[PDB]
Write a protein that binds this ligand. Structure first.
Ligand SMILES: Cc1ncc(C[n+]2csc(CCOP(=O)(O)OP(=O)(O)O)c2C)c(N)n1
Ligand SMILES: Cc1ncc(C[n+]2csc(CCOP(=O)(O)OP(=O)(O)O)c2C)c(N)n1
Ligand SMILES: Cc1ncc(C[n+]2csc(CCOP(=O)(O)OP(=O)(O)O)c2C)c(N)n1
Ligand SMILES: [Mg+2]
Ligand SMILES: [Mg+2]
Ligand SMILES: [Mg+2]
Lengths: 535, 535, 535
């Protein structure tokens, strides 16, 4: 078992923060798989299909900051396309490793299985270029430094990477790295940082009131603590949008709720849009997050910081690391200080869930009523809120949850998913069972896609779905389900079963019966804007 | 004239070693052009067409290690494609800057001139991806760090880079860099270098005789001195192939001539192929350099070092910088010490030229009899030999020469070009005149493409060319040609004209009449192999 | 000499209307070249470089409706990129044939010359995809039907096509086609044509006055006669823009001059923009043709016909061939009837040229004062006016002229080119000489790029050019120039010389001395708009 490229790769995975590898075996990656099984630092996690695997890796990365996925040439990698795309869209560092035929076989252009039958082997590699920030075809001559390059680029941009690993290359000899792959992000040019500082100061110096608006990018770049500390030391109005929900303890002073354009509550709208200068940190104003771009923030009124550039008014200062810009803003901000029960409905359902969430929780909500209902949950401290509003691929959360549980075995995972969504990735529930995870899964059963009904064709057949018997799924995907299932239809029951599971001694699945047309407050707004675009 | 992106870019150009900018103006780059003219560090050099400009930049980069080209969107950039491609093929760091329409206009998808008329503005950018190692579309939010990224990647890989500079972005405010862009190439993993060292030692330790074979990559990575020093301290048989010709003083001990497979002389073939261990440094065995892949070197018999990886036998050690690998090899080597006149013809022409070349010369030879004749020149010290065997685009050398003169005003530039080749880039001779350069240009007039004739269809009309009156060209491309012209046909004539022009007090153009079918020794071999491929 | 793929290809070329093949030889296309030389239907035309060749083919196709270009892998094809792009931008059917290495050698991924040195052979093929409507890599199994498919697609869309011809494939056996490749463009769906007809009628039925505006697409689709006949039978105000100049006899009734937005004369602006319904046929409103999009034409006021779709008001009728739409419009229209100097200057130069042009002339004008001055020429009948306003690549017209002469040996070719422009493709003048063509070439010598000066930096060094001795160029690019040359500075001299060369018994080159800042009327407008975009 001499040390080889396969081992080098795994070592770099661990250096990056990954302790598991998701994926599904395939002819071309079996031998590589031996190495991951023999590795004492990487644990193999086989999934039901590669789409789920990619979702799982995404979830995992949202917990540990990095993840890896292993698929097989063609059939495996293409099945994961939507997953990687989502990771790229929401800045989630997922490494995609694809086992491929030997270099010699590829040169020969043979009619190998898992190919288009044309002797071409770079089709899928090129198809993956738009959804990765770095990729490479590993060869006997570039193996190690290419591996280090993509991984390094991944950590810098916080996005997916792609590595084609030909089976023979995996076996090639290599020597263990003396040093772990370093992150060490470069500092900003002092002069540029100064220019930014001066511009920011002049702006904040004349500001009557200042507000802070932060989103997902701060989560991706590990600046949560920086922001919590900031708002604690310098009290001010502060919020996040759906994507960044979870960076703040929403029970603290200065938090009036989650911001989402004109669809926000009057308090939030006032606290944020009302300030004469608002700091936008790691912010991305997508249509879903702003209720159709109805946010009232102007260039003059704002200061925004992005991963590698910051802006004050109309001027941009490129070449400034997000962390340094935030640091500068904190210093300046200290320099200008200023003074019931019954039948279940979306309404009472979210109200009940509110009294249930506890610190240290990991909550995932899928597209639809789940996500736009959960947006109103007032989160305690140390809770990881996982949602995917920009990419918005339904089915994601159930699989993502499996990934989160794998990353945090000792944290309570709450999965909020619609009945339509859960159908797309149901088989991963079988993986939760196999690995004996204890997540508390709530399926909002409203007999279909109510968000779609809300947008158009409420009574159209295409918004219906096969009606499943949810509570019986666990015993179908397992020979001995360490699970507990319930069908709830009354607020009381829901609250009842919630306390019975609040300590997750087993996988618990709760089928929550809800009205077909019942829609959360926010959702109505977003829904009316979407159909307005269709007309 | 506030400091802006345009200025930031130029400053980085100078940091990289460029003092000139080649190109041809265009609507979209005029404003940017102002900045280069006002810059005290960058000199603008307008050319006759973009193709020539790109060739000139390549030649310039082969002298100063870096160059920049400026063209206009669409019509300008595509005209330079072949040049950039050649730079990429032969590892020449040329930065291609293309002035483009404003970002707003591009978003609007307007029917602007220099477009395909479809509202798309990324076609040409994408078309340039295969021939650059890094590229970027500059925006108001990424300007500076993207500019530094491509330039940095260029210096690392020694290859072309591409920057699309929208006119409005050029005008955006920026702040001067406090520090010059650093190269600082990373060191190899001590463990990997060790493994390479041990493997190399075991191999060298049992070697009866060792030989050194170096090529162009050592020139590109600035290791010319390292190799000269090496061979001086550790005497051994050593050579280069056509591409790397010039790294060694071929008058020194251990040099028996240029290596080119079985087409080499018996002495060279024995000195190199005869050693039981041959060191291949920065080597690339192309068909033209090996006479149809007729080199007799085996894996076991060799040790090769590439830019980022080295090999001994069948084992590769990836992640080792070329300079460190050479350093290691030098240490280990010291541990194993082991003791004309008459009618002109290709024959007497090259013999004459041999007595003419002097140290400090810069010699350029185009594809055809020029290049395969010049390969036998025994070069003195400090001479820059410029040839392009891998890409092999005829016309290149005349324009490249202009670039070389621009970079080395005080060095004697000898241009060896065929009559067919000179026709493709003739107008750049007008630039030489305008800038009052004093090249000594020799046009081998054999009435056509004799190399092609040698390959196939010797008496075919397609190998003929319009017959020009070469000695009258200067007075056609200038109102006051600071030049001297000669039509030579006897070795004595050539001999005398060369003594006259020895100190290049003026541009001198020598039309050398040669036989239509006269071919140099080496060329016959290469020629027979090429047609063998056609059958 | 058994019939092979090479022969099949040539036969298809002739079927398409080509009698010549432009290009420059190369190792990989020599054997194919034998076939073209032996062909009694295709004449080989070797050029100075492949950029010029592609321009020549473009010009040729503008005369015969189809052309072919032959280059060599990598170095050849990339040099022609700008030409093919221009052809694609302006809808010129040029077939680009590139000779390539044998299929076996390509599969092997060898380090062949003219490659990037990575074993990849599809880079350039892919790079050419955005500028062609069809392309194919010829193989032993697809040769003939792929050849027919791209050619057919070319004829349909009137755009460039690409064929990679591996040397070995060219030698493969084939059988001569029984039938010539048919065009036979499909008819429109009767119901769709009816809907278009009814909509057009309702519009025309209430029109007080109707005007016709036609451009280059009618030229490309061979509908010149259809339009001339139209306007003759149904008298009405009619014009073309710069690109379509030449479709009409501008001396006839109803023609008030060339249309170009607000930069047009009051008469033209009134005749066209003044009608309540204007027919836009084969029209493309680019920025250069409309003086910065200053045309005053509204959707309700217009009816436009494109190659495969027509529009009336806001409704589009897709699936209607241009020729049928025109036919329908003609029928409906018939249903609604209604009631000297001394010192030379741009002014007196164009006035003089006006009295010189005669029916049957072929006039080419390059970008700059040439094109924007020639736009005011009142053209007689049967004159082919060649200009390239959309792509706008300078240097194009000199080479294109060579192509036009080749296609029309017995027509008088007038080349109007600036001194800046002619420098980029000057060597093709050598080809005109070699083939003994009798162009009458006028070089507007105003010491530089006056259009650029008019746009920005009038006194900037970057708008200057090497000053050439134009009248001495022919005797430099030929050993026996069958030509006459004159430097002209007075209007008297211009008229005189023009009378001497009227019957083009020889190549005649006229250097026309003009003021550095002298700009034509129209150009001032276009110039002010371009710099407005830079700010
Ligand atoms: C992969 C994928 N396919 C289709 C869609 C379109 N879509 C968005 S929401 C939705 C339905 C949501 O159904 P569900 O989970 O039932 O939500 P609820 O009725 O709870 O709102 C669909 C089909 C999507 N986002 N992703
Ligand atoms: C741009 C380009 N076009 C075509 C070729 C194919 N080619 C290789 S050598 C050659 C002719 C060389 O002519 P010349 O300079 O006359 O040389 P000689 O007769 O001295 O061998 C040609 C056309 C090429 N290398 N590059
Ligand atoms: C290949 C190419 N390079 C650069 C340009 C930008 N350009 C447009 S017009 C022009 C100068 C025109 O010079 P010239 O032929 O002298 O005309 P005049 O002075 O008659 O206007 C230039 C450089 C272009 N259109 N095409
Ligand atoms: Mg549902
Ligand atoms: Mg020659
Ligand atoms: Mg001019």
């Amino acid at each position: 078992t001499p040390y080889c490229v396969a081992d080098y790769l795994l070592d770099r995975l661990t250096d990056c923060g990954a302790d598991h590898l998701f994926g599904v075996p395939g002819d071309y990656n079996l031998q590589f798989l031996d190495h991951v099984i023999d590795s004492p630092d990487i644990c193999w996690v086989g999934c039901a299909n590669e789409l789920n695997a990619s979702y799982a890796a995404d979830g995992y990365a949202r917990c540990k900051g990095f993840a890896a996925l292993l698929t097989t040439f063609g059939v495996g990698e293409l099945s994961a396309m939507n997953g990687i795309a989502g990771s790229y869209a929401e800045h989630v560092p997922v490494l995609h490793i694809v086992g491929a035929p030997g270099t010699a076989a590829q040169q020969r252009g043979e009619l190998l299985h898992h190919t288009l039958g044309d002797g071409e082997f770079r089709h899928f590699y090129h198809m993956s270029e738009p959804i990765t920030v770095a990729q490479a075809v590993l060869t006997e001559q570039n193996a190690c430094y290419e591996i280090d390059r993509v991984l390094t680029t991944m950590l810098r941009e916080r996005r997916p990477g792609y590595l084609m690993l030909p089976a023979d290359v995996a076996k090639k000899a290599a020597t263990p790295p003396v040093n772990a792959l370093t992150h060490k992000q470069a500092h900003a040019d002092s002069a540029c940082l100064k220019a930014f500082r001066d511009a920011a100061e002049n702006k904040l110096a004349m500001s009557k009131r200042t507000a802070l608006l932060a989103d997902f990018l701060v989560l991706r770049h590990g600046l949560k603590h920086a922001l919590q500390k900031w708002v604690k030391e310098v009290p001010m109005a502060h919020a996040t949008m759906l994507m960044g929900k979870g960076i703040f303890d929403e029970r603290q002073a200065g938090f009036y709720g989650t911001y989402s354009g004109s669809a926000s509550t009057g308090a939030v709208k006032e606290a944020i849009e009302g300030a004469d200068t608002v700091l936008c940190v790691g912010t991305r104003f997508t249509d879903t997050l702003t209720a159709g771009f109805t946010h009232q923030l102007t260039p003059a009124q704002t200061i925004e910081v992005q991963p590698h550039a910051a802006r004050v008014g109309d001027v941009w200062f490129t070449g400034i690391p997000m962390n340094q810009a935030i640091e500068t803003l904190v210093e300046l901000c200290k320099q200008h200080v200023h003074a019931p029960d019954g039948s279940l409905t979306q309404e009472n359902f979210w109200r009940t869930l509110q009294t249930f969430i506890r610190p240290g929780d990991i909550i995932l909500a899928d597209q639809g009523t789940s996500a736009f209902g959960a947006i109103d949950l007032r989160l305690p401290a140390d809770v990881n809120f996982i949602v995917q509003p920009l990419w918005g691929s339904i089915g994601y959360t159930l699989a993502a949850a499996f990934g989160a549980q794998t990353a945090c075995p000792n944290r309570r995972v709450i999965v909020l998913t619609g009945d339509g969504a859960a159908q797309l990735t149901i088989q991963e529930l079988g993986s939760m069972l196999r690995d004996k995870q204890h997540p508390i899964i709530l399926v909002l059963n409203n007999e279909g896609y109510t968000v779609e009904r809300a947008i158009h064709g409420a009574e159209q057949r295409y918004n219906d779905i096969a009606l499943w018997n949810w509570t019986h799924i666990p015993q179908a995907l397992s020979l001995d389900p360490q699970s507990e299932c319930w069908r709830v239809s009354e607020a009381e029951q829901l609250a009842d079963v919630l306390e019975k599971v609040a300590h997750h001694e087993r996988l618990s699945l709760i089928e929550v019966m809800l009205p077909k047309a019942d829609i959360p407050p926010l959702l109505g707004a977003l829904t009316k804007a979407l159909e307005a675009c269709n007309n």
